[PDB]
Amino acid sequence: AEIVTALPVPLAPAPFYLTADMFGGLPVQLAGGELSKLVGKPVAAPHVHEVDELYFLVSPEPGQARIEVHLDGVRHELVSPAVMRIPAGSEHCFLTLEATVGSYCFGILVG
Amino acid sequence: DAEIVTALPVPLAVAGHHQPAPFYLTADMFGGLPVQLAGGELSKLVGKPVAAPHVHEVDELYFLVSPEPGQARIEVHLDGVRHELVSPAVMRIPAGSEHCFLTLEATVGSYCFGILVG
Numbered sequence: 001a002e003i004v005t006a007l008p009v010p011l012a013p014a015p016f017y018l019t020a021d022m023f024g025g026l027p028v029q030l031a032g033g034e035l036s037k038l039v040g041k042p043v044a045a046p047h048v049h050e051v052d053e054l055y056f057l058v059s060p061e062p063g064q065a066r067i068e069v070h071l072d073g074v075r076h077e078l079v080s081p082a083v084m085r086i087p088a089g090s091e092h093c094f095l096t097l098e099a100t101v102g103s104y105c106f107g108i109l110v111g
Numbered sequence: 112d113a114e115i116v117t118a119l120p121v122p123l124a125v126a127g128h129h130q131p132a133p134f135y136l137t138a139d140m141f142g143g144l145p146v147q148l149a150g151g152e153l154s155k156l157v158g159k160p161v162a163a164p165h166v167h168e169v170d171e172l173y174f175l176v177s178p179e180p181g182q183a184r185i186e187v188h189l190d191g192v193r194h195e196l197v198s199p200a201v202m203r204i205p206a207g208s209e210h211c212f213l214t215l216e217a218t219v220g221s222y223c224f225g226i227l228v229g
């Protein structure tokens with residue numbers, strides 16, 4: 001049985017739960033984390049990937065988490081649940097506006 | 112102005128499952144994805160299986176996560192053998208294996224996601 005438990009893995013420094021090398025190779029990588037601890041961050045740093053990224057925002061009940069996604073100088077405000085595609089090349093980040101305990105935003109890099 | 116999906120989850124039927132499963136990524140989104148991702152919050156699933164044992168022709172990952180390590184536990188049946196997963200954990204289920212899971216323990220904000228890998 002193939003079980004990975006040494007998780008998340010820091011990668012440059014974001015917490016990964018799926019990496020492209022696991023289990024013989026994956027077509028996605030998946031990072032992210034619990035949002036309630038991030039409601040407090042006042043700033044986020046724009047960045048760009050060479051593959052598409054999907055943001056996946058979820059909370060125990062719909063509507064309990066809220067982020068702003070800054071994409072190429074446009075501010076978007078999303079409420080859980082929500083998925084948003086960030087095209088490769090695009091400058092982006094998000095800030096957490098609101099979150100109950102056990103709200104998550106995951107970033108999924110699509111190979 | 113990129114693509115946002117908020118009509119979620121998407122209920123799809125999956126073999127052996129009592130009710131439609133809640134999908135957040137499906138294969139046709141955004142021009143086509145190499146994965147599908149379903150699942151959700153476990154705190155009201157404790158003791159209650161979502162499915163009879165089932166088999167897919169694709170690999171499935173279970174991804175189990177909770178606000179703190181150790182707050183969620185599931186039991187995966189994989190071809191008659193029982194495995195306990197403790198958050199955080201990723202388990203690969205090879206295509207053709209008969210399987211399902213039972214939630215053993217979960218706080219509010221514990222999740223299990225099933226990831227079907229093309």
Ligand SMILES: O=Cc1c[nH]c2ccccc12
Pocket residue numbers: 131132133149150151152161223224225
């Ligand atoms: O992967 C299947 C799954 C995980 N959580 C739920 C919740 C409800 C139906 C199906 C499922």
Ligand SMILES: [Fe+3]
Pocket residue numbers: 047049053092093107
């Ligand atoms: Fe990103």
Ligand SMILES: [Fe+3]
Pocket residue numbers: 165167171225
């Ligand atoms: Fe399955």
